[PDB]
Amino acid sequence: RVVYRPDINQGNYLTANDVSKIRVGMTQQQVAYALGTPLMSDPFGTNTWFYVFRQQPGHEGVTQQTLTLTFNSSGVLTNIDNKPAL
Amino acid sequence: VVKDIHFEGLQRVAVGAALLSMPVRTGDTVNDEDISNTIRALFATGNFEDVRVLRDGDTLLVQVKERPTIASITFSGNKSVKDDMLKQNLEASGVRVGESLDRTTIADIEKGLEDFYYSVGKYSASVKAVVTPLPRNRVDLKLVFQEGVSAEIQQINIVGNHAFTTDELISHFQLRDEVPWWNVVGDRKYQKQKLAGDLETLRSYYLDRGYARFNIDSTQVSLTPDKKGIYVTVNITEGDQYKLSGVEVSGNLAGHSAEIEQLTKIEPGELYNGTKVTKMEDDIKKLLGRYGYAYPRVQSMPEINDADKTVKLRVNVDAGNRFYVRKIRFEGNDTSKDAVLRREMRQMEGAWLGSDLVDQGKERLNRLGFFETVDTDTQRVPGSPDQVDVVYKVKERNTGSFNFGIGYGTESGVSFQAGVQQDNWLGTGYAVGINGTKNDYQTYAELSVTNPYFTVDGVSLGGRLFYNDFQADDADLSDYTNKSYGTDVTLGFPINEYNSLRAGLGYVHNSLSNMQPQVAMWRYLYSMGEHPSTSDQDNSFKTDDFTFNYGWTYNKLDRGYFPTDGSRVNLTGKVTIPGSDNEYYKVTLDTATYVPIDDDHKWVVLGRTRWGYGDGLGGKEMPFYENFYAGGSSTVRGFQSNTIGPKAVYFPHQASNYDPDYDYECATQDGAKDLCKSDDAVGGNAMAVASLEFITPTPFISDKYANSVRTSFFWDMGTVWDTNWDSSQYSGYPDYSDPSNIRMSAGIALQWMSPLGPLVFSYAQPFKKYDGDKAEQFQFNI
Amino acid sequence: SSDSRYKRQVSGDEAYLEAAPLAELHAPAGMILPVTSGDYAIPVTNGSGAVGKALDIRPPAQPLA
Amino acid sequence: VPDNPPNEIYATAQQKLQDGNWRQAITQLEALDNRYPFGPYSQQVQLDLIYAYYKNADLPLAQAAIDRFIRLNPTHPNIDYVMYMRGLTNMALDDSALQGFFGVDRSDRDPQHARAAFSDFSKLVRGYPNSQYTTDATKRLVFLKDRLAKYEYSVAEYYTERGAWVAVVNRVEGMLRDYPDTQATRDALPLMENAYRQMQMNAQAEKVAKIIAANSS
Amino acid sequence: FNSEEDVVKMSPLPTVENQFTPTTAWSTSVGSGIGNFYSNLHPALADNVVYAADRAGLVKALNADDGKEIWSVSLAEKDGWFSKEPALLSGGVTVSGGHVYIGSEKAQVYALNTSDGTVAWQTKVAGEALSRPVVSDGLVLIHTSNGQLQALNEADGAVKWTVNLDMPSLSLRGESAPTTAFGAAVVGGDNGRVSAVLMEQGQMIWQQRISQATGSTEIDRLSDVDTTPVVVNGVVFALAYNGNLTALDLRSGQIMWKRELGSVNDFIVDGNRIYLVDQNDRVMALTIDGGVTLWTQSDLLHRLLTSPVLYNGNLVVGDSEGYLHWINVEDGRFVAQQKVDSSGFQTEPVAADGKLLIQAKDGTVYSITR
């Protein structure tokens, strides 16, 4: 069957709200505890951080929200990564 | 200055060892200080008490009483009391096996038993604890226990009570006065905590009722000196009911407000009684828990106005522990693979609190019944106030299966009834079921195979592969032989997890050679148009049948080893597409239900029933082997196994390609040579079977024992009527067109599911049948 | 389990005498590769007891009593 | 069970041990332990019982005797013997060879008994890296590390199929931090790569592919 | 099913001497009534009349008569969650002259000043009922062993001075109830410390710790410790719930004559002349000389007694199942020649003059004299 599949999630939801709570840069400790668990732990090098929600609900809709920041210091960033479904 | 003297008889802590144990170290200026030191320390050590200062010349010479140490406790007297609480109260008393014996501690265990009786309730302090120092090192302790006393507690002293009838309250309680002759449901007995629980019983009772000033204040215990007529008195302080017309709330839950508003959607008339909104609070509670929290602090604080009887309730509402996510773990996985159990799980990392997830995993386990400590441990994973570890216990037993029957063929090739089940073969990710009844000339071979997954969407690798060369041989095989051979294999995408109408492939052909000489057989072949014979058992049929069938299955069951909440449902229906010899419309129906009639559940009523009918090609009689046999076996017992309904009448035949002489009872070479009354029950085309039984603990066994042992009692009822039947020829013999073959019989059934032996001992005493049913008396099942 | 063992040295393979490639993972000098987190280093021993089979499978000592 | 004068007690027992029917010997030694506890049999009888148990592969009896001795005696000249046998029995806890034989083996079974084994052994070496025991310790140490690498491989590739491919990711990061020294781990490296594939994450995929090239397994 | 108890030493009937005729001049029942359920039953006699009541408060009067028993006041309350529930039957009874004083199971006061038969004064008050109503001059004063003092005072039905005292966890079946000696409202040790709350408006006069009224210390309890007072010659013999002796007078612990020898079941400690039956079923007639007397015939064993009523020198102590035991002058000796309503004996009798007053669990008024 390529007709249907039970619905698919990779959660820890969020919104541009707590995003607005956040901005470019503040100590990797503070934000680290602020927006939640670091979803994709960069292994090596670039403190590249990946707030991505993924949603595939049954053959009509989607949400691939992807986020990445860089904290190579006291927690300093200049990193833009947000995008809806893709 | 001493020589650490000679002892014609020293044994214990010794010349030197005792030399130093007491203030009598060789080389000492000793004063009477040391003498009293010896004396007292001798008492003191708790290893030795024969205490003296007996100096020859001035050399200490002694008759000893050597008793180290405590050696033979004798828990004398244990009526319903076990020796273990005696032992544990013993170390509680400060001495034990392996303890230094200070004869001081004695009375303690007296008390240690005496007071012990209180915690039970019933108290008969008779504590005969006597010690015998056996004079080398041995000690024999006689621990004689007399406690004649019971907690038979009936003081329904219920007072302060003028709102709910005392008797109503009693009914709330666990102290009644009559043993029903219809069902065991009554209570009369004690414990401190039964007390408290009943306190809450009536309490919750009231406050639930909407009480808001109710409390209890009287607790006056009394027992007669005879220690049995137990009267204890209690009084309360009632509350005030209300009518509700006022509401307040405060939320810091991040965004679920008017969903509450209209989630309740009350209108201006509704009454106060509190537990209603307690379930409103559970509403909004799990509402948020699903939304993505775990521990908000949310309370509904009420008020008390009667000065207008005007009450308004307030609620504080936090947001909670949104996102604590850590991997899942297992413990108790020891022969099962991680991966298969993970195939069980449906959980997903990277979300927020879902009860449905973990508790369904619980239940999915419960379904398995090979292994059980269903334990979802989901504590905060330490540190990073950001996550929660997930971990899982299970307790296992070596569980494996084989069924067969006693004999016969040990005089012959080791004969096999081999149905064997690893059930760790699903430990291969897929389980195969195998039984062949490889009987001397009955070569039954089957194949059942299921991986629950071709694909995880639910499609399960389920296949059924068939052959039997059946000969039915005692003195010949040309009475009949079958190359019989068919496979049915499922295909279904079960989208709902309880809806399945599916489309697997169902085929058989069989080679049917030299069949039997019985009247039904003849007319059935006549019905096939293949008019049969008159004196042999030699004929032909090659059966090739083509299936279009749908069927639906619905089962909710808790425990895999042994359910309690039993609702299992299985239905099959076959519309047979042409090129089949018979285009049969076959309907087969079976259900089973546990109703655990109690919440301790030790009491479960079981009802099981089944329908089987064939309506297909109105235009053929039926290809027979789709027959029904039932009864006298396990679903019924006391009778011949699977023998019911329509009989089997032979027709005058003189060969089978040699049916042997001195043959079937009649209508052949034995007895009558003509048609006769050859009554050998085989049933008709509509079968109905049902057991009506109850299941109850024999508590005379350990909790482990009953955990493995099940005791029940059955009424085993079946009838099978052949929808297609005659009276014209049966102008003298019995017939079948509606349920009349109903019987009676009841039995005791006992099964121990020991890991190496699942054990069936039954005494079903047969107390009704009909014609063609034979008696069954003693045999011990699988 | 006896496969010519359980008599003078531990079971299991002797291929962990020839265990998995314990190889430095490869990138140029001057990079941090935050891989490593534990007590797993195996030194160049001189022993440090017996290597092979003829050893004591027997307790390192026994008291007559 | 004998109560000869107690050396002949302990001797009829050890007579059954050298006799090899170690059950009757254990009965006899317990009776000695049943009768007289005051002095140091416990040391002698306990060694007898531990050795007999674990040579019979009486695994939990071995643990029990070992522990109740180390409570009776947590420091003698036989520390290596006992701690060694503990790591061994912790191993034996993880895997049992009784169904392993129509073609069966346990490669991704109870983590925690392997935990106990690894703990005992690394403890012992960081205390006692100088014994015939130490060699077994390191041998089985790398063995179990690789073993549980494969356990992880089982579990994580299971996800990968099941589609916790990001959870796969962080698991692989786990074994990374664990050890890049055994071959399943090598094999896994491309699995994290696969995660990068399926999760649309591109340059990281390039990088992991380069690492797959670099350590080439 | 049946394995919870052990053997008990019992010596039912080893000796009887027919040297007493326990005749009867009447022998009457109105039938339980009693059942088996604690309260203060006794054949109390007023001016040659015993007003025998069985259950549902049924009173019928045998007035020193060969067994006619009629003063029909057959009364359980008109009402309830049963509408005349008669059971749960324990009531306070008093006759002051011709006035009946009945509390019903829960402090239910009823003044039947017998002139019409059932004389209709009632006041229903909350609480519970254990002991007798002690009418000190219109003052229906009761202690119930919930450490409670109640003054149903009938110029209105009840004028309330409520003095709830200390109590231990186990309610003392030795009940405290007012015993008046010279204004001496003598009420015992509620945990064993004897308290005086004498009414002026409800007035705790004095206490003095005496002994233990046992409720929670795992000690000797078995002896029938009728934790009850006997003020006489000033010296008060209030049984305390640990089985040790004490004598207090001048109100006071200024004497605590505490000679212990053991513990007793039945006592009347009358002046100095003591009549004491132990749980050994050994009776002494103590004439104290330092407190030493045991005349032990434990040849009877563990049978529940009823208050030994002496008449004609004749201390007839009633123990269950048709046995009363008639200790005349000789001590501690009698002859056990018995005929009564052998219907078990389970609570105290109240007797009168040299005759006998008995009331049965099944029968009511039997005249077992000579």
UniProtKB/Swiss-Prot annotation, chain B:
Stretches assigned to the POTRA domain: 1-67, 68-148, 151-239, 242-320, 323-397
Record note on disruption phenotype: Deletion is lethal. Depletion results in the accumulation of incorrectly assembled outer membrane proteins, including TolC, OmpF, OmpC and OmpA. Decreased expression leads to decreased susceptibility to contact-dependent growth inhibition (CDI), and decreased expression of outer membrane proteins (including in this study LamB) as well as up-regulation of periplasmic protease DegP.
Periplasmic-side positions: 1-400, 423-430, 452-459, 483-498, 554-566, 596-604, 695-708, 754
Oligomeric form and interacting partners: Part of the Bam complex, which is composed of the outer membrane protein BamA, and four lipoproteins BamB, BamC, BamD and BamE. BamA interacts directly with BamB and the BamCDE subcomplex. The Bam complex has the shape of a hat, with the BamA beta-barrel crown in the outer membrane and the periplasmic brim formed by the BamA POTRA domains and the 4 lipoproteins.
Recorded consequence of changing residue 476 to L: Very minor growth defect
Function: Part of the outer membrane protein assembly complex (Bam), which is involved in assembly and insertion of beta-barrel proteins into the outer membrane. Constitutes, with BamD, the core component of the assembly machinery. Efficient substrate folding and insertion into the outer membrane requires all 5 subunits. A lateral gate may open between the first and last strands of the BamA beta-barrel that allows substrate to insert into the outer membrane; comparison of the structures of complete and nearly complete Bam complexes show there is considerable movement of all 5 proteins. (Microbial infection) Acts as a receptor for CdiA-EC93, the contact-dependent growth inhibition (CDI) effector of E.coli strain EC93; antibodies against extracellular epitopes decrease CDI. Its role in CDI is independent of the other Bam complex components. Is not the receptor for CdiA from E.coli strain 536 / UPEC, which does not have the same mode of toxicity as CdiA from strain EC93; the decreased expression of bamA101 in some experiments decreases the level of outer membrane proteins in general.
Organismal lineage: Bacteria, Pseudomonadati, Pseudomonadota, Gammaproteobacteria, Enterobacterales
Outcome, altering residue 227 to A: Lethal, protein does not accumulate
Transmembrane segments: 401-409, 412-422, 431-438, 442-451, 460-471, 481-482, 499-511, 540-553, 567-576, 585-595, 605-615, 685-694, 709-721, 744-753, 755-765, 780-782
Impact when changing residue 157 to A: Lethal, protein does not accumulate
Written domain comment of the UniProt record: Contains 5 N-terminal periplasmic polypeptide transport-associated (POTRA) domains which interact with other subunits of the complex, may recruit substrates from the periplasm into the outer membrane and also act as a chaperone. The C-terminal region forms a discontinuous 16-stranded beta-barrel transmembrane region. The central pore is ellipsoid, and probably closed by extracellular loop 6, perhaps with the aid of other loops.
InterPro entries, per database record: Bac_surfAg_D15, BamA/TamA_POTRA, D15-like, OM_assembly_BamA, POTRA
GO cellular component: Bam protein complex; cell outer membrane; membrane
Keywords attached to this entry: Cell adhesion, Cell outer membrane, Membrane, Repeat, Signal, Transmembrane, Transmembrane beta strand
Domain of life: Bacteria
Species of the source: Escherichia coli (strain K12)
NCBIfam families xref list: OM_YaeT, PRK11067.1
Effect listed in the UniProt record for changing residue 637 to A: Slow growth on solid and liquid media, less protein accumulates which is more proteinase sensitive
One Pfam assignment: POTRA
Any one GO BP annotation for this protein: cell adhesion
Localization annotation: Cell outer membrane
Outcome (variant: residue 440 to L): Very minor growth defect
Protein's name in the database: Outer membrane protein assembly factor BamA
Segments in the Extracellular topological domain: 410-411, 439-441, 472-480, 512-539, 577-584, 616-684, 722-743, 766-779
Recorded family membership: Belongs to the BamA family.
